[PDB]
Amino acid sequence: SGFRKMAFPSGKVEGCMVQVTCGTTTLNGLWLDDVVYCPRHVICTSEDMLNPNYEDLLIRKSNHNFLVQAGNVQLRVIGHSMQNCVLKLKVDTANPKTPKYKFVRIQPGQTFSVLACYNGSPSGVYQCAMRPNFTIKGSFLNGSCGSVGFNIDYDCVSFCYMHHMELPTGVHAGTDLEGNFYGPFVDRQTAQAAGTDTTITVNVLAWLYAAVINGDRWFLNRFTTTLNDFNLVAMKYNYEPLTQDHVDILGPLSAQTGIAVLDMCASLKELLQNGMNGRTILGSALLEDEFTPFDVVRQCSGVTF
Amino acid sequence: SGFRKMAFPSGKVEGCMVQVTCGTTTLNGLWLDDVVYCPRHVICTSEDMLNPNYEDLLIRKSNHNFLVQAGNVQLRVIGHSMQNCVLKLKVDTANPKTPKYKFVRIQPGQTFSVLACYNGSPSGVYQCAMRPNFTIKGSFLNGSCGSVGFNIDYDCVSFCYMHHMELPTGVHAGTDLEGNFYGPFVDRQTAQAAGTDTTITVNVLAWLYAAVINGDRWFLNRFTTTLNDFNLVAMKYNYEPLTQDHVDILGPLSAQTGIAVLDMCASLKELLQNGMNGRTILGSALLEDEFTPFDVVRQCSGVTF
Ligand SMILES: *[C@H](CO)C(=O)N(c1ccc(C(C)(C)C)cc1)[C@@H](C(=O)NC1CCCCC1)c1cccnc1
Ligand SMILES: *[C@H](CO)C(=O)N(c1ccc(C(C)(C)C)cc1)[C@@H](C(=O)NC1CCCCC1)c1cccnc1
């Protein structure tokens, strides 16, 4: 029993983190096979950051300008290219620790684990979600640039995020491993504001199922509702609208608890309209929305890797 | 910026987890050097659990009754002994992945990372605290037995917890790596109730410093108080009493924020007496007490390992 903010084990991603220095700037890179992946703004200076032209900045850069260290050893850079907003630095040695892996571009509402790194070394691991405004609410300091977000299905690490920057509001922006940003953000020091941070309704519902599974049932009400009627209340509270796919995805949790999804929606609606009255649910006084219906299943079933 | 429930990187402990089976029962073990550590109730049956005599049960057990697997390989058990509530299984091969390590018995209020395992394989990692009633609020299912809790200072893993059992209230009990339980619990299936779960005051205060550091300042009030006067309000709210050592330990955070500890106490007292008015602090609507004054420092300074 119990229910925690649980991240995947970080070992397989730990053995991938390197340090990339280009002239003055040092951030983290991701070493898979014979390529090192890192944010392209590694080539930027103090002067370049408001308005950088990355192609022009790359003319003045050769293989030997990129210093890549793995622990105490240097790696020889035999080729470099820019794919969207990441640099791919070909090195002459395959990473012997390279795990099985995929690159995947996640949807808003999906969760992943972040291994926060500084100077190529890991500091800690934690779980977060791609928000519907395509930010993530991370824990990142200067130099965390190039840390990666990932899921693990059994043996296979599917990397889904690379950390690029912090916005003035303290939230975080980044790219997939092909260098395409999530949402509208760009790797320049220019006014960039997040859109509305709406709540991931399906994730809230899945977390409510996890509470029932753990014995926290006081919020189970005597009502049901409809998809259309719930969404009227949801949009008023800046909840993401619930779809039939969301219902279908909650099916396994429906089945395990004996509680129909639409009944769970009426319970959520009552919690939204009346508050939590200083009670808690699974140790929280907020409706937690960063657990997916696969997250609860895994944690409440013990799926290993 | 940002502030998350951050665990240490789990890689070094991952490479230590094995599977221990004794007759019918299978749980996790910890393989450091040529010894495997695991909970002694691995030798218990369905019939033994209300009242087991572990010495009598050990008479009927020899080296070859303990099946220890690391992945797909078996380890040869050349000797076994019981130290308090753990078994130490001497095997004929040193773990080549053995990290630098210490065994430490933590104090209530201290935090650590848990690598939750099933059948010797890791499922996820998360952070928790030794509560003042000597329970921990974990995420553990059947078979998680033998998972370990740990801190990492740079290169050195100091293991501090091994998971033994769940109490009927859904919280968790366990031992240090010498097999002495935390608090009064015993490895039998018998009525065991937790004492009062009081709040770790110093950890709440440290978390308030982390909010200020991150820009969340609305709770900074216009008061100060004294140690004695704060504790009058603290004991009413089942907060642990604050000492001068707690003050001294908060000193680095005092210095970094410009906010005296005793002023921070008056702010906490106001939050305790008046509530949070539906506001949040660092994304929480509860006063979070599972971050120590070393935790905030590390996360708000980027200490790597
Ligand atoms: C990256 C490693 O130095 C880094 O920490 N970082 C950052 C700096 C500069 C950029 C440019 C794209 C502008 C070159 C990108 C990332 C900082 C950061 O994001 N600072 C921004 C700069 C613009 C205004 C808001 C803050 C950083 C700090 C903490 C966490 N992540 C990133
Ligand atoms: C250990 C691995 O099987 C395990 O999960 N577990 C457990 C069972 C039995 C014991 C004895 C000491 C009684 C032999 C210890 C641990 C269960 C568990 O703790 N069940 C208890 C048994 C007594 C009443 C309350 C539940 C477990 C389940 C989830 C998380 N941790 C442990």
Angle at B38 between CA B77 and CA B151, to 5 degrees: 125
The tokens for A86 are 């990441």
Angle at A257 between CA A254 and CA A263, to 5 degrees: 55
Element housing A157 (H / E): strand A156-166
Q: Residue A15: list chain B partners with CB under 8 A.
A: 11
Q: Which of B275, B206, B214 is nearest to B242 (CA)?
A: B206
Angstrom distance (rounded) from CA B275 to CA A65? 56
Pick the CATH number of B1-14+100-197 from 2.40.10.10, 3.40.390.10, 3.40.50.300, 1.20.1050.10: 2.40.10.10
Overall CATH class of domain A15-99: mainly beta
Query: Could you please report the per-residue DSSP string of A79-148?
Result: EEEEETTEEEEEESS--TTPPEEEE--PPTT-EEEEEEEETTEEEEEEEEE--TTS-B-----TT-TT-E
The tokens for A192 are 């960039």
Nearest to B139 among A2, A122, A124 (CB): A2
Entry resolution in angstroms? 2.0
CA of B142 to the centre of ligand 2 (A): 6
Are A9 and B125 a contacting pair at CB < 8 A? yes
Overall CATH class of domain B198-301: mainly alpha
Q: Please give, one letter per residue, the 3-state secondary structure of B180-203.
A: CECCCCCCCCCCCCCCCCCECHHH
Are B1 and A121 a contacting pair at CB < 8 A? no
The segment(s) of chain B belonging to CATH 1.10.1840.10 are 198-301
Give the residues surrounding ligand 1 with Cβ less than 6 Å away: A 27, 41, 44, 49, 140-145, 164-168, 187-189
The segment(s) of chain A belonging to CATH 2.40.10.10 are 1-14+100-197, 15-99
> What pairs with residue B161 in β-bridges?
B149
Burial bucket for residue A158 (CB in 10 Å: 0-12, 13-18, 19+) = middle
Give B1's Cβ-side CA count (13 Å radius): 19
Give me the phi and psi of B212, to 5 degrees please: -50, -50
Task: State the method.
Answer: X-ray
Are B302 and A139 a contacting pair at CB < 8 A? no
The tokens for A115 are 């291994």
The tokens for B300 are 């708000």
Q: Please give, one letter per residue, the 3-state secondary structure of B217-235.
A: CCCCCCCCCCHHHHHHHHH
Determine which one of A44, A117, A128, A145 is catalytic: A145
